[PDB]
Amino acid sequence: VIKSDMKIKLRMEGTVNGHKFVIEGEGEGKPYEGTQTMNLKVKEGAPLPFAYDILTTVFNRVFAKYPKHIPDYFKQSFPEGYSWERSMTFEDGGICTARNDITLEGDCFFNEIRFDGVNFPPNGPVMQKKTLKWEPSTEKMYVRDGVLTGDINMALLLEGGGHYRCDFKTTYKAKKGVQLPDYHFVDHCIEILSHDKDYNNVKLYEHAVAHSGL
Amino acid sequence: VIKSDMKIKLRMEGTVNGHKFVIEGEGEGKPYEGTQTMNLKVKEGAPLPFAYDILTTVFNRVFAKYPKHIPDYFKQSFPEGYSWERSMTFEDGGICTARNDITLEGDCFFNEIRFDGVNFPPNGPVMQKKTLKWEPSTEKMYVRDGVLTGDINMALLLEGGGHYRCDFKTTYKAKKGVQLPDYHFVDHCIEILSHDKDYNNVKLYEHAVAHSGL
Amino acid sequence: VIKSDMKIKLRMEGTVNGHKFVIEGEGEGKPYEGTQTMNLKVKEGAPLPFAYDILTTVFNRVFAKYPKHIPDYFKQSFPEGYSWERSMTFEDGGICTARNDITLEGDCFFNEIRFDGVNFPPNGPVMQKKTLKWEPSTEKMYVRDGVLTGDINMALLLEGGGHYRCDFKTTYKAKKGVQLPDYHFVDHCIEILSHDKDYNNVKLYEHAVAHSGL
Amino acid sequence: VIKSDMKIKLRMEGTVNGHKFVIEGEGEGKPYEGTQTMNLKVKEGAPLPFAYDILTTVFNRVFAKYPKHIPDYFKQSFPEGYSWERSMTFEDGGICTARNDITLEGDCFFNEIRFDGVNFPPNGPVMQKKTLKWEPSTEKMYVRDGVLTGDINMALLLEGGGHYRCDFKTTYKAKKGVQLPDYHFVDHCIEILSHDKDYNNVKLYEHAVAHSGL
């Protein structure tokens, strides 16, 4: 079922700072190379009044290169699939919650996403769209009460330089029992490859690689 | 417009641990006495698989007794009204986001509520419904970048005794400029007066009183 | 042993931002009225390069008015006495740890204090001495694994107005078993009554009152 | 001054849970290979009543392999040297503060260390010595207001399996201006190579490597 080439369909509905929106996406990736590319269209709530970058890491750890010696929680989870929940705690008190329900129909991953952001200061970098990109990162993966937890120290590079910090916690729940991995890492980088004026259209790329550290 | 007796209508839509639900409520309160009572019906997602108590403080600081010497951000905000956003950070990593858009039509407050909870441990008190009540509390109210912020150290009393701690941050945004108060407190207590087996029906009561501390 | 009038002797040794100091104090209070006054002298590390206010709440919950219906963990702890540990988490990442070992010799409380502060931004209000006072507060008191825990949402009023937030957690350990109270509150206010140029000399006052909330 | 082979002398004084101790160490490392080994003796407060592992990462980022393309804040700081401050926020509310003042005399780094830990639950893994090791980690390094900040998601592996999480923030201050690096990573692993019954004697090893991520 998980082939060397898979397609991806997604719908996100969300509210940030009380602003409602819908974004749909279509793309493709190489699960075994840990790469994926997606084309995202704002369907409702254009133009977004917040930094598009807060959304991009919510737009599937199936797209991560897992070595033999590390059990692949994500790939083992299919065909049944899995869901995740995430909190994003920004250093200025902005908080987001997000979830994705991931299903497999043929060679296509369907992603049903909800995103909610609250308490962004009105003159902070998110509401004033001062973000350039996410720096690369390393997710710390560990089992807690029988499900996979990922913690990340994430940072947005700001216009003018310097960084806006965010702590991620993701809980990943396979819909069937799998071989649980030991403590390990997933390196990430995520890049907006192109966008129009108000990010109504966005081409998004991720590379991810699992490893056991030093 | 804000009389000694007002009615309240609400709809909450939410997702906790991936479980979708809708709850509607009707009730009444005394804004100047800082009291209110509400009758809540689960409309979708019965029976709730999580502790109903995580919802109750999301089900309007108009219902708080404000003394003369403290400017009433909430009552001054009408007829135009106000909205709030809240993060609830539980000590075991459970996080909720919530928002309420409050409008005034005649003597009735309409409440449009969204609630989302993530990362509740499956064997924690919320997913195992081990909560008895919220302890009383004191909200710390202060202006930050021109809007009212409230911080609360909240605690749920547990079955077996001892407490489950939650930190609230609420940002309150009047839809028109008002007299901003100085740093002050709002004492709260919130009580489920009655409920059926699975909290399909709930009668809920709050008392709230603003003060300037010692 | 705990009379209506008691004396207080203290020595604090500490390091903030790498700056070492020693402060000694002598004063007096009314345990049953929940009041105390103290005279503090900087003995080493004058002039302090940080906001003196970060120290003042570390300079004994014996000085709190406890009503009959709330068991007094502190007063019950003597003659043997008690110790406490505290973390102070400031909203800009400044963190302090502090401890006090409290003994009773005659009508005098001896206080052996250690205070350590790290990660204060060099252009933040603590290192630029922009604090005016602590706002009043309400400490939430609860038992956790057999010892009394206090949580406080504290705020320093800043020069220019607006607030610098700090979260306190104190663990209070009686040196003998006592009647553990139920969940309750202690209202505080703390005031620098007078000081010289660089706070080499400071007269400090606290009022504290325990209550059961609404 | 920073040769391919350097010696290390250290003294830590600290208090955890009110327990006072002094630990001295002597060792050696390869700054350009990012390796170091140290022999630590408890001089006061034997036997330690807490998990020795909370101390080991406080026992100098000079011992990290820095590639050409990343400015070496640490090595550039000598001969004048640098100091750091650290907060360690454990997931059960245990908090430590630590600092190190690092000087260079000949081929020897001198380390003047203070460590303070508070609010460790009495039946938690630190006070019940249930820790096996620190998992490897990746420190996120970024400049904030002109000094180097490092954030780490750290985890102790527990007896019985599963993990105890700790968030590190270190502020690193060179005693002279240097070439500030861009956002980057330092991979770490730290290992107790050997110890006696109560960790009165400990041989400690670290490997560290700076990189720019994916």
Author numbering:
A (entry chain A), B (entry chain A), C (entry chain A), D (entry chain A): 5 to 63, 65 to 219
What does the original paper state about this entry?
To round out the set of related FPs, a new FP with a novel chromophore via ncAA incorporation is presented as LEA-H62X, wherein X = 3-methyl-histidine. A rather surprising finding is that the 3-methyl-histidine (3 mH)-bearing chromophore in LEA-H62X leads to pronounced on→off photoswitching (orange), where the GB absorption peak exhibits a large intensity decrease after 2 hours of 505 nm illumination, significantly more than LEA, together with a large increase in the GA’ population. The ncAA incorporation of an extra methyl group to the chromophore histidine ring greatly reduces the photoconversion efficiency versus LEA and the LEA-A69T mutant, but surprisingly enhances the dynamic photoswitching under 505 nm irradiation which can result in a larger red yield and red:green contrast under dual illumination than traditional 400 nm irradiation of LEA-H62X. LEA-A69T crystallized in space group P212121 with a full tetramer in the asymmetric unit, while LEA-H62X crystallized in I222 with a single protomer per asymmetric unit; both crystal forms were described previously for LEA. However, the local environment surrounding the P-ring of LEA and LEA-H62X are essentially indistinguishable; therefore, the blueshifted absorption of LEA-H62X likely stems from the slightly twisted structure that results in a reduced conjugation between the P- and I-rings, consistent with the blueshift according to the particle-in-a-box principle. Regarding the drastic change to the photoswitching behavior under 505 nm irradiation, the pre-twisted P-ring of LEA-H62X may enable the substantially more efficient on→off photoswitching than LEA. The extra methyl group causes the largest horizontal shift of the imidazole ring in LEA-H62X relative to LEA, with LEA-A69T lying between them. The distance between Glu211 and the α -carbon comprising the bridge between the I-ring and His62 is 3.7 Å in LEA-H62X versus 3.5 Å in LEA.
